[PDB]
Write a protein that binds this ligand. Sequence first.
Ligand SMILES: *[C@@H]1O[C@H](CO)[C@@H](O[C@@H]2O[C@H](CO)[C@@H](O)[C@H](O)[C@H]2NC(C)=O)[C@H](O)[C@H]1NC(C)=O
Ligand SMILES: *[C@@H]1O[C@H](CO)[C@@H](O)[C@H](O)[C@H]1NC(C)=O
Ligand SMILES: *[C@@H]1O[C@H](CO)[C@@H](O)[C@H](O)[C@H]1NC(C)=O
Ligand SMILES: *[C@@H]1O[C@H](CO)[C@@H](O)[C@H](O)[C@H]1NC(C)=O
Lengths: 50, 38, 50, 60
Amino acid sequence: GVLTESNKKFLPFQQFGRDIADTTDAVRDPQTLEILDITPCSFGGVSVIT
Amino acid sequence: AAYYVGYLQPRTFLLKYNENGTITDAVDCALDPLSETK
Amino acid sequence: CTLKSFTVEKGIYQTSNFRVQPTESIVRFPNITNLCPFGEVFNATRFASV
Amino acid sequence: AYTNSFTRGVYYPDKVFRSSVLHSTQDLFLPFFSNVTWFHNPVLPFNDGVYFASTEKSNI
Ligand SMILES: *[C@@H]1O[C@H](CO)[C@@H](O[C@@H]2O[C@H](CO)[C@@H](O)[C@H](O)[C@H]2NC(C)=O)[C@H](O)[C@H]1NC(C)=O
Ligand SMILES: *[C@@H]1O[C@H](CO)[C@@H](O)[C@H](O)[C@H]1NC(C)=O
Ligand SMILES: *[C@@H]1O[C@H](CO)[C@@H](O)[C@H](O)[C@H]1NC(C)=O
Ligand SMILES: *[C@@H]1O[C@H](CO)[C@@H](O)[C@H](O)[C@H]1NC(C)=O
């Protein structure tokens, strides 16, 4: 994915968050206690206008 | 001084998380039929 | 090559998918910790017999 | 010395952070509204798990 800085606050024993559909989005960095998010890489369909 | 000792069983629970990620309420599944519905 | 012909009518058509490929890999294990006392063994005062 | 267990013994099943989620899980737990043995010494069977609660002020 695409890691980025996050404004979410974890809990001091908690490792990594999840979502409603059981998908991982928030991963804590192991060394630094900064919080990182996950955004999937861009994709889509290609169409031809002719 | 006083102390209480119980025991643990493998029964399905339902948990309710909050905005910060703290467990605030839990419901048993095999206690009474209303909780079975829940 | 999608509509198997040489003439294409006016409209909109879907051909393929657009996708972004990853650039590199980053692995961050937990911080380092309790070492093994190997230097105690080799730099000892005296060694036992066989 | 039987005492009602009320609703206690709830512990975090694993290490995941969910917000406003009603996720339900299957694991070992203390049953709701059970009987616990009030004590005031001997050996006890461990079995699978145990919910040990203590009220004291002398740390003994
Ligand atoms: C492993 O842990 C040490 C100590 O927690 C980290 O060292 C700290 O790094 C921060 C980063 O800005 C500094 O502000 C502290 O002053 C450092 N403390 C010490 C005692 O050195 C170290 O960075 C961690 N390892 C990695 C790879 O990040
Ligand atoms: C979550 O944490 C914030 C931090 O101050 C606090 O204000 C809020 O009350 C907490 N939420 C609950 C449900 O306690
Ligand atoms: C023993 O001590 C010397 C002196 O510093 C050091 O260079 C050497 O690495 C030590 N031996 C081991 C096995 O670490
Ligand atoms: C606890 O023990 C009392 C006395 O024996 C009994 O009346 C009660 O039904 C018991 N509770 C449970 C949940 O078994």
